[PDB]
C-alpha cells in the first residue's frame, strides 16, 4: 500500500478547507503528527490516508 506524498496530503486538506488540527482530529492523531506528515518527516500510514479521504469526501 502506497503512502501519500506530502504534497498530496496538503492538497487534499486544502481542498476541503480544513485546518491541520481539524485534519489530525479526523484521523485520531496529534497536530504535530499531521505537521510531520506534511513536512515529509514521517510517512502517513496508508490506512489513515484512506480514512481521511473517506471522511472528507
Author numbering: 3 to 59
The authors write:
Aca10 is the most recently identified Aca family that is suggested as a transcriptional regulator by controlling the expression of acrIC7 and acrIC6 in P. citronellolis and in other analogous contexts. In conclusion, Aca10 from P. citronellolis is a dimeric DNA binding protein and a likely transcriptional repressor of the acrIC7-acrIC6-aca10 operon.
The diffraction data were collected at a resolution of 1.76 Å at PAL synchrotron. The final structural model contained most of the Aca10 sequence (residues from S3 to L60 out of 65 amino acids) for all four molecules. The structure of Aca10 showed that it was constructed of an α-helical bundle fold comprising four α-helices (α1−α4). Analysis of the surface electrostatic potential of Aca10 showed that most was positively charged, whereas one face composed of α4 and a connected loop was highly negatively charged. Since DNA-binding proteins, especially those recognizing palindromic DNA sequences, are typically symmetric dimers, the AB dimer was the more likely biologically relevant form. Salt bridges formed by residues H30, E52 and K57 from each molecule were the primary forces maintaining the integrity of this dimeric interface.
